[PDB]
Structure formats: structure tokens, C-alpha cells
Design an enzyme around this catalytic site. Structure first.
Site, mmCIF file in Angstrom:
data_model
loop_
_atom_site.group_PDB
_atom_site.id
_atom_site.type_symbol
_atom_site.label_atom_id
_atom_site.label_comp_id
_atom_site.label_asym_id
_atom_site.label_seq_id
_atom_site.Cartn_x
_atom_site.Cartn_y
_atom_site.Cartn_z
ATOM 1 C CG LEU C 228 -2.175 0.697 1.114
ATOM 2 C CD1 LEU C 228 -3.151 0.325 0.397
ATOM 3 C CD2 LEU C 228 -2.619 0.939 2.662
ATOM 4 C CG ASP C 229 4.008 3.384 3.174
ATOM 5 O OD1 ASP C 229 4.659 4.225 2.255
ATOM 6 O OD2 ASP C 229 3.508 3.519 4.466
ATOM 7 C CD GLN C 230 6.140 8.083 -1.867
ATOM 8 O OE1 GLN C 230 5.470 8.840 -2.691
ATOM 9 N NE2 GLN C 230 6.574 8.632 -0.724
#
Lengths: 285, 285, 285, 285
Positions: C228-230
Site C-alpha cells: 500500500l505504502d509508497q
């Protein structure tokens, strides 16, 4: 829309801005940008660039000029010029061996970030014919022979005069220009060169700067003058260097710095933001 | 000499500059600086700061105001203000635990690089009394108790009102201000805070930025509003950080960045170069 | 001369530099650049980049790699890599409508400032075919139809495999990549995108920004991850904006910012100066 | 914890890093920072700075120094130094009329940003007595009478000796120092001064500059040497100027530039990050 640019320089007196903004208002224009500078509160010289719009900036132009000249210009002994953005200044790029400056200009031109009309590239070397022609721009190789300098310059002039060159850009052109030549392009020839701290006059400055242990590399874009003294400085900048960089790495840093500073100066000259007075410039960014 | 500053904001229409420069010319003034901005060519809002000089800017002031108001202001529905450089804005600095912001301001004030009249420093902590008093400035320690917030704020207001504070500067004041308080200092309360990329809402952002591996630290100086939304941003800047910096080294970089950005904003607000409209500013540097 | 680069990452332990340099010394190599870093004084992870040259980096390479693995690597539990400057990394560029980031990459590549081997350009639009092929690079148009996204990724992947792409660059590729896709390029997909202070999540960033009255614009390049995270940020930078610039000129500066920021992260990657640990990077410039 | 710093310079040879780090490892030290540099790949001189901590840098120091001298130093013919962060270098500040550089040093020192032990301030003017002593630092006024310069230097030197000054900072000290004086402070006298593009040699630099229409102003900090030539440069930087700034505001930016540039070279010196070789420096920041 069409953007008109009014460049004005004259002796500083009270009421110039009132007169100009007032004239423009009566002619139904709308100022979209206005900047001004005075070298001295009282006395000295006045500078102003006014960008504006207005309906029918076409045949309404020669008339706009007549009036400004009769009503404002003569009153204040102004030196001025009315320029339009739609106008694309016919330019020329002279270059010798180095190609970093030329390339940045060609590319910036290709992606539409330099509002000019590049007519041709003149070189006293053949080296860049291939790259330049790939851009759809005429490459003219005209050798510069020993003593036969006058020989070369005649061709170059004829070339520029034939093309209607309004701006000449020296993209690291390594040959000197006789005062006669410069005399035909007053504040129309932009040049670029390396700078240092302290200045390094000698053979291989990028070896003397490294030898002195400088922490900065400079570059100066200026107008060329017949004058014995370097013309109006347009832009100046620097790139930081450390003990780390080798003569090899400094040279690369200096080129990137040169092509950047030179393009910046050309872009400004083309957007009509450079006002010359004496041996200095007032750049309206 | 005396420098007068005319700040003007109003609906954008043709002829504002002509009207203003023309008014100033008839009153025998000389523009030493003129800057303007339009959010939109046609429609939108107009902004302008005009710095000028003129003989007898004393009792010739209230009259200069009457005329500008009757002749220009009313005509264009302008929001304006006439400020003089000789005027030294009575200011106050609120501070809590951190001292980097306060110190930079005090010192910059001491060496005469901030044109204000620092009346007092208010703190909900005692920590800085010694340093502040060494500068010959009143230090007021007024605790901020739990729930007894209204308790504290009453004193602070009375304090500022008693001193005639025109500008309040939050030099890293860690207590929130009720809308009622902010309501008495419209676009007169400048604040500073940390910023990031991406933004870091949480506990110990300087630990979350380091945790995300950011290459930048930001700081934002803005006007404080009752409004639920952060007030007009005045200035913003950043300091580069690398894998090298530790939470310890980032914090030092962020403080140096904060005290710099905040002083810059205060200096601008004092030199009368900040025009507010909606929730943004037009800073005339 | 061939420049070898040793990238090493491992649990911070005393004596890692001694072991690595002692080893290189015994193998008759000379260190031309050495850079190291430790996230924490005690514990944490060690990072290091050693550039060196050596007599006969010929088939002497496999032995060099075996010996290092046996003697130093296994011992210090290090994830390492030994790259050779002459190994020009086969890379691919994905792009959609916007061309600013693509063009910069193409030109810098042509002028030799990006040590890679561009194999191909892939787009869900045909727009850039003419320009890309003018650079002598294959152009492959793979549309992305809603519902048929699956089919697109498979083709894109076939092309990358058939080309042996080691690095995938997203020069403003506007389509989402499924985790399945990213999983095939661990820390091998560099992307670029906007950033603001404060951040923005909606339609028209360069609109919500001009709206908030920001004085900066940010750009962030980073490796892409499945989650999900960059992914790990590689580089971040800013461009100052003001009241002067319009919503138009704000997008122009934002492009010039992104293109420069992305090209930078690409060059650092191609030059083997990026090490990833967790969700952050160490960049030895 | 005590941070030890190993500064080393010697004829570039393979295996220097191996020997130095191997040695520190054997002595149970942990490297917290390591930086090296080689002027030339083959031949030339090696430079390196290693910051490390260790159990009991107590009387364990002399042994540490003996062992390094015997085992590594003599072997590699290195000029080296082992500094300890806690050893606050006793320093002195000379100053004349201008106070900008002095004030910056004093404030940064008071706020703890300059790790030194200011012992005294000496001036050929009495002007700054009040301010300097307000910082708790002794002020010693030694006039410099034409013809009696000799007598002045001797007193200045007596004061420095009696104080055991290790670093002499010239915060815009306007009097010449005889070679005899400098000879007593090899690479221990840091000076600051103007710089321009192009350079200037005459009366009123910030006049000949505004005259040439420069767009930058430079400042250079450097160690002082007996010889004719300027000593090793330590740091250089610039401030952009334009048409907007006046000859007045050009001097103001020039001061803020010098003060920052000089304070920087001072901090780097105090932090043991400067190595001199010939007439240049290596600065490990």
C-alpha cells in the site's frame, strides 16, 4: 491573446509611470505586468517594462507607436521599443569546438522553451553539422584562416544579413570578432564565459582553479561590445565544487553551468526583459 | 528621508495604476518603488505596493489620506493602508519551551535587522527569562493551566492591549489560541511550523520523516486565523537532509530553518510587503 | 580502465571497513572512492560503497566475487553487489500523455549524461512514437482498456522480458501497476510525481496549490513497491513559486522540477549509488 | 561518550584505509564517520578523516597515539593528528571598525554553535568594547600607529601567548600582519574578505561592482600565509544581487555573506574537518 511589451529607459523624473500607465489606459489596454527601476531616487535613469494586452494589436500598432512617441516618448526623452510576443526573433548561433552550449540551446529550442526563430548555425569547424542538421537547421561551415580573418567575417556577415538575424548567440565560439562586426549588432550579441574567485587569466583556467583549490565555478553571459571593456553583464551564476572534483569533473560542472546561464540569458533577451544602459543591464524577471 | 508605503488591494479593472501613480504625482511625490500583481488579466483582484518619498510627510499625512480616499480609494473600492518606515510596530513574541526562534528574533532585533518595537516576551514557561532580560526586554511568565486556559489568555490579552501590540509573533509557542483571541489580531499573528514531503501528522514527526527517509525538511510561516483552516501562508522553505543526518541532526537543521523562515516573514510584515486576500498572500520583495 | 563498484549493506558491526578494504588491498585493487554510513552507533545497519580499479577485471571477476563471498560476505551477513561501470543497465521507459519527463530522459541519454542502454519506450498512447523513434529507440503502444488492464500488463511484461530490462522508469506513466507486476521488479521501478506543502489529494494539484498560496512546489522520485505504502524515496527537491507565477507557469515549473528530479534518481541508480534498507535509501553521491 | 577524530594526510598508496581501520578495529574503536580522498588515482596525496568513539579515551590516549605512530604513521609517512571533540580550541578574534563578522561569531558562540573557547578579542579600535564584554569576553585595545606597527604586533602576540591561543580569527581586521607574525600561526589564522565577478582592486569594491552591473557578490574565507600569495582557500560562497538592490543594500548583503562564510570556515576548523596540502584544502563536512 497578444502580449505587447513596452520597454522604456530615460532620465529619472517624477511622473513617468503616471504618464505611461495613463497613456496605456486611454488606449484601452490592460497592464498584465509592470516593473520599474530607478538607479537613483532623484537624478539618474529610469527603467520600465510594461507587458499588456488590448483588442486589435494589429494595424492598431503603427498608430500606437506614433502616439506614444508624440505624447510620451518625446516629452521624457525616452529610449523605447514596443515588442510583441507573437514576433519570433530571427537568431543565429556561432559555435566552435565545444558543443555543450549549442546543444542545450538546440534542444531547449526543440521542446519550445526558447521563443526565437533559429535561422542557422555558423561554425569555423565541421564537428556539429550532423547533430544540427538532425534538428532541421542549416549548418554553415566557414573556416577562420590565419590572417584571413577578414576573409571569414565577410561571409558570416553576409550570411546573417541575408537571413535577417536580429540576435547572434555565441555558444562558445572560440574566434575573436573585429569591432567592425560587433558594430553591426549593438546589444544583439550574447556571449558566455567561465568565471572564478579569484579570476584566472591564463592557459587552462580549469587547471588553475583546481590548483588554487576554489570552492566555486562561475559563468558570465554578457552583451558583446566593440568597446575595449566587456559588455553589459546579463546573468551570472556559480556551481559549487569541492576537493573531490578533478579537472575532469570541474569541466563537466562548468559546462552544465555555462549552457544553463547562456540559455537563461537568451530566453530573457527574447522575452524582452533586458534593458541596457551604459555598461550594465536591468533584467526584469 | 521618510519613506511612505501605499498598500492597495481591490477588484482588478483597467486604470488603477494610472489613477494611483497619477494621484501621487499630483501630490508631488516620487515613486522609489512600485510593484503590482493581478490574479487574473480581466476579473480577479489587484495588488500593489508603492514606496515613495515627498517633502513634509508629517501634517501632510492626514490630508494625503483624505484625498487618496476620496479621489482614488472610493472610486475603485480599494482596501488600503498608508505606512511610514519611521513607524516602529509595537510587537510581542510568545514562546514556550523551544528557544531557537525567539533567540534568532531577539538577536536580529539587537543588531538592527528587524524594524519593530519589541515591547515584551510572553511565555507559559520560565526558561528564557534570563536571556530575554539580558536584552532589556520585559519577560512575562504566565502559566497555561489545564482547563484554566481562558484564565491565561485573559492576562495575555490585557498585556498586549496594555502595550499596544500591533503584531504578535508566535516563536514556537506550544499552546493553542481560542478563536476569540485570534479574532483580536486579524492578519497580525505570524506563526511558524515544520513541514514535510509527504506531510507527517503524528507524534514526533522528526522521527517519522527520518523513518520515511525524506531528503527534505520544510518550515511554513503563516498568519493565524480563527478559521478552521491554516491562515495565509507567508513564506515557505526547505533544508536538504540525507541518510547521514540522525533525528538529532535533522532537528538542528529544522530549527535553523525555522528561525530563518520566521524572521524572514516578520521582517517582511514589518517592511509592509505582505498583502492578504482570501487565504493567500502577495509578498512584494 | 574499468571502475568496479562494491555496494554493501549489513548489520553494523565493528571491523567491517577493515575487512572490506583489507580484502581489496590483498587483491591488488586501489580504492578511488569510499563512502560508508551506519544508521545507529550501536546496533543498526551498515552501508558502504567502494569504487575501485584493478589490473585485469577480466575473468578475474568471478574469482573476485567468489573470494569476497567466502572471506567477507558470509562472515558479516551482508547483502552485496559488485557492479562494473561498463555494464550499461538495460532499461525501459513507460509514459502516458505527459512528455516532459520522457523528453528529458531521451535527451540526457543521447548527450551521454545517462549511463544506460535504453531498449524501449512503452505507452498506453501513441502520441510520442514519432519523437521517440527519432532517437533510434523502439516505440511500443499498449492501450489500457478498462477491464482489459490484465491483458495489457502481460504484454508490457513480455516486452520487458524479451528485452531483458533491468530498470523500469515511469516517466509520468498514468496507469496503475498491479502488485503482480511490481513483484517482478524489486527495487527496479523508479517513479516520479508531485508533492506540496501542504500535500494535496484531489483533481488538479497545480490548482489546489495556487489556491492555498504555496511558495514551493515539490517533486519526489522513488522506487515502487507492491504494498500500500509508497516505496523508498530516492530524491526530493523544490522550486520556489510566488504571486508572480500563474496556474499555468506553476505547471511549467512543476514539469521542469519533475523531469530534473526523476532524471537525477535515474542517474544515481544507473551509477550504483543507491542502497535500500527497509523503506528508505542511502544515496552516496 | 567522547568522539575522537583522526586526520591523516600522506603520499597516496594502496592499503592506507586497510591499515588505518584495521588498526582502530584492533584497538576496539568503532567508526562513526569515515571520509577519504586522493588527489590522483596513481601517485598524489591521500587525505582522510575518521571519527570514532572508544572505551576509555582516558590516559588510554597517549598509548593510542604512540601505537598509531609506530604501527601506521611512520610506515606511510603521514602527517596526522588525533583530536578530541571535548578539547575546545582556545581562540582569539581580531577586529577593526566593521562589526558584522565579530557579532555573528559572538552570537553563534553564545548559542553554542561554535565549539571553541573564546579567550579574547583584540582591536586597533575601542568601538566594540561594550558589546564584546557584554558577552563575558575580555576586550584588548591595541592601536596601530603608522611607524609604530612593530610595537603593536609584539603586544598582540604577548596577549595571544599568555592566553595560549590555538586559532586566530580575523573578523574583518583591517591592519596588515607581518610575515613574522603569521609565521607563528601556521595554518592557524583564518581571514575573510570580498570577491567579485570580475574581481576588483581599488577604493570601494561595493562601488566598482554596482558599477560593473554584477549579479553576484562573493566572499572567501582562507588560512593566512607568510608568502605573497593568498593562503589555502577554506570556503567560498555567493549572494545574488540585481538592479533592485542599491549600493547600500549591496554592502548589507555582502556583510551577511562574509559573516556567514567566515563563521562556516571557523566551525569547520574547530570541528577538525580541514586538511591542508600545498595551497589548497580538503574539507570533510
Amino acid at each position: 491573446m497578444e502580449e505587447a511589451r513596452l520597454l522604456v529607459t530615460c532620465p529619472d523624473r517624477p511622473g513617468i509611470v503616471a504618464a505611461v500607465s495613463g497613456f496605456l489606459y486611454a488606449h484601452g489596454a490592460n497592464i498584465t505586468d509592470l516593473q520599474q527601476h530607478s538607479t537613483d531616487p532623484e537624478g539618474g535613469t529610469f527603467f520600465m517594462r510594461v507587458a499588456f494586452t488590448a483588442s486589435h494589436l494589429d494595424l492598431a500598432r503603427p498608430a500606437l507607436e506614433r502616439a506614444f512617441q508624440e505624447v510620451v516618448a518625446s516629452r521624457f526623452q525616452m529610449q523605447w521599443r514596443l515588442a510583441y510576443a507573437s514576433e519570433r526573433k530571427r537568431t543565429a548561433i556561432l559555435v566552435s569546438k565545444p558543443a555543450h552550449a549549442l546543444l542545450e540551446l538546440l534542444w531547449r529550442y526543440r521542446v519550445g522553451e526558447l521563443p526565437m526563430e533559429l535561422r542557422l548555425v555558423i561554425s569555423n569547424h565541421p564537428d556539429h553539422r550532423e547533430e544540427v542538421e538532425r534538428f532541421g537547421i542549416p549548418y554553415h561551415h566557414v573556416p577562420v584562416e590565419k590572417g584571413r580573418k577578414e576573409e571569414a567575417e565577410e561571409r558570416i556577415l553576409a550570411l546573417l544579413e541575408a537571413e535577417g538575424v536580429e540576435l547572434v548567440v555565441l555558444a562558445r565560439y572560440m574566434q575573436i570578432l573585429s569591432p567592425g562586426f560587433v558594430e553591426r549588432f549593438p546589444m544583439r550579441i550574447i556571449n558566455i564565459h567561465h568565471s572564478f574567485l579569484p579570476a584566472f587569466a591564463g592557459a587552462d583556467p580549469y587547471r588553475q582553479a583546481y590548483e588554487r583549490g576554489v570552492k566555486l565555478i562561475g559563468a558570465t553571459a554578457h552583451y558583446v561590445t566593440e568597446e575595449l571593456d566587456q559588455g553589459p553583464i546579463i546573468e551570472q551564476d556559480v556551481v559549487r565544487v569541492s576537493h573531490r572534483h578533478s579537472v575532469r569533473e570541474m569541466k563537466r560542472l562548468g559546462r552544465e553551468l555555462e549552457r544553463t546561464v547562456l540559455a537563461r540569458a537568451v530566453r530573457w533577451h527574447l522575452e524582452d526583459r533586458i534593458l541596457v544602459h551604459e555598461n550594465r543591464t536591468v533584467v526584469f524577471v
